[PDB]
Symmetry: D2
Subunit: 369 residues, 4 copies
Amino acid sequence: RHLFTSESVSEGHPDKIADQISDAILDAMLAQDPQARVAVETSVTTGLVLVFGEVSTKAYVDIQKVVRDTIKSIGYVDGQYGFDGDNCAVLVSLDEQSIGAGDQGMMFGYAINETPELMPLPIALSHRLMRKIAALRKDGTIKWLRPDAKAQVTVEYDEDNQPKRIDTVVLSTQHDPDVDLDTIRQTVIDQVIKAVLPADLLDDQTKYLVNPTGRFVIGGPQGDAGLTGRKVIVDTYGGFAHHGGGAFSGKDATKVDRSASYAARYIAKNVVAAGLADQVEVQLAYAIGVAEPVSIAVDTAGTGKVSDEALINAIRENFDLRPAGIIKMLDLQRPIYRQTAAYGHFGRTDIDLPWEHTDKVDALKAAFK
Amino acid sequence: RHLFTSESVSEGHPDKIADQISDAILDAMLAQDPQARVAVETSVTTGLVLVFGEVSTKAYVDIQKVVRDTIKSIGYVDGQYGFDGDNCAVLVSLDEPLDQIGAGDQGMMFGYAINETPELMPLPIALSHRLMRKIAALRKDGTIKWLRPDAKAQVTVEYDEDNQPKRIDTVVLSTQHDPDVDLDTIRQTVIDQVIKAVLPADLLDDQTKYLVNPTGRFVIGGPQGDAGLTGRKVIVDTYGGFAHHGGGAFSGKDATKVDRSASYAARYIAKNVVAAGLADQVEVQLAYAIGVAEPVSIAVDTAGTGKVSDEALINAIRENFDLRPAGIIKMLDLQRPIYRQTAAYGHFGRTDIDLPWEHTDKVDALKAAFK
Amino acid sequence: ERHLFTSESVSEGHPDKIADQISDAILDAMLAQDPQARVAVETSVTTGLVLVFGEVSTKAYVDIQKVVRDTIKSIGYVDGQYGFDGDNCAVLVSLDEDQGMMFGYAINETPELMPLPIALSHRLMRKIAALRKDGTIKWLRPDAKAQVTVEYDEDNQPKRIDTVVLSTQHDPDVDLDTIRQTVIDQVIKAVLPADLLDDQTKYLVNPTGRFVIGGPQGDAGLTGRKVIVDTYGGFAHHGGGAFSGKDATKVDRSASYAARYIAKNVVAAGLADQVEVQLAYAIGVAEPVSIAVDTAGTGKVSDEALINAIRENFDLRPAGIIKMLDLQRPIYRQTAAYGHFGRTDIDLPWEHTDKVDALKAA
Amino acid sequence: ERHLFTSESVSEGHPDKIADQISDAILDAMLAQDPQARVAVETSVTTGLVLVFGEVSTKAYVDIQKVVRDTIKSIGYVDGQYGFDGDNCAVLVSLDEQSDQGMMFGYAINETPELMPLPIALSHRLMRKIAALRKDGTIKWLRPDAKAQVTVEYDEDNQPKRIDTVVLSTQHDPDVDLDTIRQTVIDQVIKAVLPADLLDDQTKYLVNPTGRFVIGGPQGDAGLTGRKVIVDTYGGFAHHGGGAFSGKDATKVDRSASYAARYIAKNVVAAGLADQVEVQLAYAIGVAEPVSIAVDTAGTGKVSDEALINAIRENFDLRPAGIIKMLDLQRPIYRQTAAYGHFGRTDIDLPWEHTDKVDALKAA
Ligand SMILES: Nc1ncnc2c1ncn2[C@@H]1O[C@H](COP(=O)(O)OP(=O)(O)NP(=O)(O)O)[C@@H](O)[C@H]1O
Ligand SMILES: Nc1ncnc2c1ncn2[C@@H]1O[C@H](COP(=O)(O)OP(=O)(O)NP(=O)(O)O)[C@@H](O)[C@H]1O
Ligand SMILES: [K+]
Ligand SMILES: [K+]
Ligand SMILES: [K+]
Ligand SMILES: [Mg+2]
Ligand SMILES: [Mg+2]
Ligand SMILES: [Mg+2]
Ligand SMILES: [Mg+2]
Ligand SMILES: [Mg+2]
Ligand SMILES: [Mg+2]
Ligand SMILES: [Mg+2]
Ligand SMILES: [Mg+2]
């Protein structure tokens, strides 16, 4: 029985709090200094936010205000949650310091026509569940919802490895303590899960598990811990793709780890959007102090409507893949990163990310003329 | 040109300092309480070690002593380096059949093995690990007294049309050193006593690029200029990006965490399959459901190197491995202090230490399943 | 020119007192299992944070996190609406493994033989706290402060009470007029002696106004930054140690307790109306090398003769003081708020007047 | 019975003084750009750690990390030798952004030219000398952390009769034996600073009686802002309202009125209106002027107490705002006070140590 599970987490999850803080600080600095170099880790545990890293910028930023404001947007805005943007400890250890690649790295991109956003079905549905739960909290539709939430979607795959059905949805949400489990369960199933899962993939055997922990009143960093870059699979493709092993949040586009991974997605997505494959993993190899990627591999899983060598050729001709090139190409020296630090860097329908534009379709179509 | 790069890092790298501390605390507790539940993150920056997490144990452990002792073994001792086990800040924020123990995460875990190396690991990650382990051994036995703990290796292997390892294209190796040694000496010494001591001669040619400390001088390192966190070397810890990920991290977690135990089990499978000659390579894929001991689903990718059916191989695995969380713990004897040693130079492919999930003692069981 | 003198006291809830009580709660925890425990434990508290740091040497097993969080809960920080909570705040722990002057003071201004300003300040903070904790006033929150200005006559006798300033943390659902009338009636008028009050006595309750979030939230607190509050409200001189976080091995603490024990017994015996006792220790000499005494000419006896009675009736060696006052017991958390001296509400050995007959007889 | 009195001072290197200097270095940094800067900055220091925390409200842009690490380097913790280092130690920062019915006491006494009690003054002079000798490189084996305790013997009339005991403990490189440490401190520090006319063959000199002392600063110990208040003031000769100075801008009457109280005491005694005086200021909530001024001359008054209080009300602006203008306190002048005493300073120029109100008081 071919079953595959992917997870996503809300803005409220401690690991995502860390990622959003790291990227909020990045935005704050790019907002004043497009040239800002940034390398900012965040750690969060019971009542604590430690920010630490190197930075090099002309920008003047009140880190405390950025951290506390980020935590408030997420929804931690009164002490009944245990965690509060105004009342939590914030400790800061920042150093201040004011082409060609710096890492001998591998970066991977992926796309697949399983969903309109060209993402695998499990990660895409997980993301849509966390984004819906969050929207329902924030617009005030469900007043008892608290920030921290998690979804795991198990999809059952065919003989052809096509998505046959949805086997299990696990969804856990933080809530006000004045709401009983039966209400939380019925409400999530009805207004979150059944609002987002396509009806044609559900049957009477689909398992819906809401808050299997039971009550979940105190959350965020309170019982738990959270760190920058511990939701890499959530951040990318839910484990459909390979990894060079950087993490994104807290890093400016100077970091090819981040910029080439965005570029790799841009390629994969345009290839599949153009119909040149049903799925493709793009593999970029950089050498230290060589701008151009030293090597480009491509895996279509034999869904390629074109040669592998011919596809690699189209990509070398229509994408600038030098670190500097990618920055100009995707316009990455702008404060666009806080919004990526929850609900996935890839497959985003709710916000406009440059590497999700399908504006290289005509360029690629034309390359076979 | 089909090129593929993997990195490994020394005990001295800040991310690995974090991983070793988290797992040193785990060992300390298992050493007194095999039943110890542990979830311990570590963060390290300039002169600082923050330890934080949940724990539940009958053990009495001096966390400060464990952290400072771990940092000293790594080699940060007697105040030379700017990071020191005796002199650094340490802050601690700690909270306080075999069927019916089912899984807690609705997770995916992956295992991998490939006959590219005797340890049955991909060539890039394996060589990277061997370089960091050699540099470390040479420091610690005192063969090269000017070496400092923090070091990094990136090995680029060139693959032919059939994706077989053709040659070694580039080795990048950066090491921390005493400031009284010039770059030319560092470079010639690393090339001769580390790289040429470890890279198989038959994969080297006059076009192999050796870049040692391409940044230049590297005197202050560890957490000093940098930052390090538990579970930010997951690719280093596993298969150098040859395999897929459910997205746990290992260090700081007791074997109660199926994220860790099933990943160990998945390697044990993959390695025994390939060791038995039932494939040249296999990725093993385990799917667990919340509160179901048995994996709900097992997939297997041989890349058409399978000497046996996929359905028949999955069958042999279900018959010869206990894959219940509790089962894996008994099977691999995981309630022992065996984890500090995994937190640098890879969890997989280890020839220098004895890890249960690296034993090839299920070969005859699997061979026998096809006669 | 009006001879006015002001002293302040602060509640368990004040951030500096939170620090002092945590440091001393950890000390008690260890003495409770190991009377020989050596302890030197500083605490710092700011927005949502408690850093504990210091040296310790003990056979005791103590969960520091549990001690810190339990201390903070007793103080009354027990739900997140206060901003500060024993369950939800950050707790960081950094625990490793004198040629001095000390001063004592006593004065017959109050039955406890303390200066009137510090004594009244302490009684106000102790009453406000009792009223919160027994649930008499449900809208009170932990953090509170009192400043009592006493007017002194010619002869420097307490003539009247000029001003009482009292500021308390409260639930936000209670109006200022209610807070003021309630504190005046159930705290101030319950504690200030009527014979020292007149129609000119100024009562200022929460002159800042509303005060809903407090403790370490807006502020900062450190171990040993309420030394004047802890002692005699500025009537006395200081060698300049602080008490909380230190076992009785620290002569800074033990000799200061001993100095009070002397002063109090001298004045209780009627040998003076007031006395400051001054103890000088030399490094590696058990006995104090020198004892001075200032009666402010209220001495019923010679200074040299009084010093003589003290040398004859008190063991003043560090070891001696520990045995004499039985100081290797967990009795210190109690002292870390509402004053080390003049305590009628708890039993401290250095407040016993059991050496009166010994000094009368001399 | 022998009337003996001991005061201590500590070096820049002592952990409590490291905390005080960091808190005041941050204050200076902000006043340097914003004279109007409101500041309330605590520092804590333990093994390899500096936590900075407090409220602040300023137009100034300050790299706190750079200020902390630079302060620690001046103190002498500079090249990874000592186990505490300005470049290698942890620095954590928790600063919030916002852009008293008190007693304060002053004291002066003609026991020393600076008009300070002899014990605290001599203690300060020993720590300042030990520090100068380290920093100018005269004694290369000295390390930052050091402590002095001076016991003075007093007469029946409480006049300084002699110096009974000097205790001085210094941190040192481990390659130097105790006999060298002792002879060097006695010769180049103690005998360089103690007035010969107060020494006799009974004067006890104890140098490093503890023994070896190679690791110090915050390493084995802990240090906090405002735990050297007696050292910072008058060595226990005076009374205390119970503020601490370092980390606080002059907006804090705790600090500004204490400076003002010293300014008064010193000018009174400098004018010869008394041999010693303790000045006592009482402030009431919402009254700029001190509500009450007491004065204790210990019967050394050459004038009435009521007449002296009158001269003080007529010649000093004692309103919080008044004191700031009077002593020009909205300037970066505070880092220098955070070691070797706020009062009696001969080596630096502090406004509250000027004796420029003598003629005003003489004339009254
Ligand atoms: N001047 C230098 N020259 C060379 N190497 C250095 C220098 N300074 C630091 N390093 C090393 O480079 C490391 C950073 O590499 P890396 O492993 O990428 O860091 P990371 O903090 O784990 N981030 P990332 O891999 O991008 O997700 C440091 O931890 C040191 O090991
Ligand atoms: N004490 C708790 N009570 C209730 N729910 C909790 C508690 N602790 C954790 N959780 C929930 O479980 C989540 C942690 O699970 P997970 O997403 O695996 O995070 P992680 O362990 O921080 N990261 P990783 O190891 O990289 O997979 C929390 O964010 C909550 O959703
Ligand atoms: K966690
Ligand atoms: K880093
Ligand atoms: K101290
Ligand atoms: Mg985590
Ligand atoms: Mg990287
Ligand atoms: Mg890192
Ligand atoms: Mg998980
Ligand atoms: Mg304070
Ligand atoms: Mg002292
Ligand atoms: Mg101390
Ligand atoms: Mg005050």
